[PDB]
Design a binder for this molecule. Structure first.
Ligand SMILES: OCc1csc2ccccc12
Lengths: 20, 346
């Protein structure tokens, strides 16, 4: 499932802004 | 969405008056309205690139606040000088129910400080991840507040540029307060800075095209999707892979998404700027009048008269149990003034 794919991903925690 | 009777005139008059108030403060910003020693530092509520947000207690009144601390030297290294001046000048000038209030600001040899209202209910991010996803009525309630907030901000020629659940706090009434104006900018016409958060970037930002307030409406699309699905419309392990998905022009919706919700999102997650809702002749009204919002009473939302989906747990003043724990660090203040010229207007 897409949900399981998200939960197993490296980006379920707080996401930092980017710059530059 | 095109009709201009009397309700649109009430909106216009409200915005006219709001702009009057804003411009007075925009042109004569508040400055140096407190001092670090007036506050007792309790606990770190969150972190960012150039500093942290700490729960503090104002000694004279006993009020709690959230104090954002920015290390001047780090702001300079990350070339965020002008963005930081933007952030404070804008935040001290705005006034809206769903924007966190700036109560004081000041600086010392080492740091910049913005003391804001403490919003005890925690980040939407924390609640969303824990519960998994919000129901559509739940997501609609939050979404409506962002819609009115962007209507307000954009009318002031502001672009917000960092919408995400991490920046939305739930107050004790269960309503939203937007925090972090680190990328907010007052600009008429195009701007070009590559900034924001990867999952939420509009295609025109990724492709270095020069862009405007329509990027906020794209980000609203991402937010609504993420609230209702439990995950964002474009995710991967690395930002570059995320960008590829964003520019591709393809989006897929969970099977539980209502027909109305999918139609709204197709119009917000629209790569073609001449078709993206929020960016057409009818402006925000194309969004306010979409039938996914047919049950939304916009005035009632603004007046906080609508019953919130949930009310955060509250264990008396100063409690932080709705926030994650962070490693605590010392606020050091050098005996020498750093970066004086750069931040003189702060
Ligand atoms: O999410 C931490 C945070 C950043 S600004 C602010 C304002 C009130 C409560 C928390 C926060």
């Amino acid at each position: 499932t897409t949900y399981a794919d998200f939960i197993a991903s490296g980006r379920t925690g707080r996401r930092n802004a980017i710059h530059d | 969405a095109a009709k201009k009777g009397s309700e649109q005139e009430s909106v216009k008059e409200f915005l006219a008056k709001a702009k009057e108030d804003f411009l007075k403060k925009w042109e004569s910003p508040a400055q140096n309205t407190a001092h670090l020693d007036q506050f007792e530092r309790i606990k770190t509520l969150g972190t960012g690139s150039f500093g942290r947000v700490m729960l503090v207690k104002h000694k004279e009144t006993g009020n709690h606040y959230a104090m954002k601390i920015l290390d001047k030297q780090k702001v300079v290294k990350l070339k965020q000088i002008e963005h930081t001046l933007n952030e404070k000048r804008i935040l001290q000038a705005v006034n809206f129910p769903f924007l966190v209030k700036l109560e004081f600001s000041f600086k010392d040899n080492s740091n910049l400080y913005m003391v804001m209202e403490y919003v005890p209910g925690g980040e939407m991010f924390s609640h969303l991840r824990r519960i998994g996803r919000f129901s559509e009525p739940h997501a609609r309630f939050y979404a409506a507040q962002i819609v009115l907030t962007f209507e307000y901000l954009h009318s002031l020629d502001l672009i917000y540029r960092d919408l995400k659940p991490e920046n939305l706090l739930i107050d004790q009434q269960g309503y939203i307060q937007v925090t972090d104006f680190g990328f907010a900018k007052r600009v008429k016409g195009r701007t070009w800075t590559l900034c924001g958060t990867p999952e939420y970037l509009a295609p025109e930002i990724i492709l270095s095209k020069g862009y405007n307030k329509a990027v906020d409406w794209w980000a609203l699309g991402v937010l609504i999707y993420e609230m209702a699905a439990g995950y964002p419309p474009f995710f991967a392990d690395q930002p570059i892979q995320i960008y590829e998905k964003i520019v591709s022009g393809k989006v897929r919706f969970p099977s539980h998404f209502s027909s109305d919700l999918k139609d709204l999102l197709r119009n917000l997650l629209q790569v073609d700027l001449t078709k993206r809702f929020g960016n057409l002749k009818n402006g925000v009204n194309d969004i306010k009048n979409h039938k996914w919002f047919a049950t939304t009473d916009w005035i009632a939302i603004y007046q906080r008269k609508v019953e919130a989906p949930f009310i955060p747990k509250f264990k008396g003043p100063g409690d932080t149990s709705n926030f994650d724990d962070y490693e605590e660090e010392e606020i050091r203040v050098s005996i020498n003034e750093k970066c004086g010229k750069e931040f003189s207007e702060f």
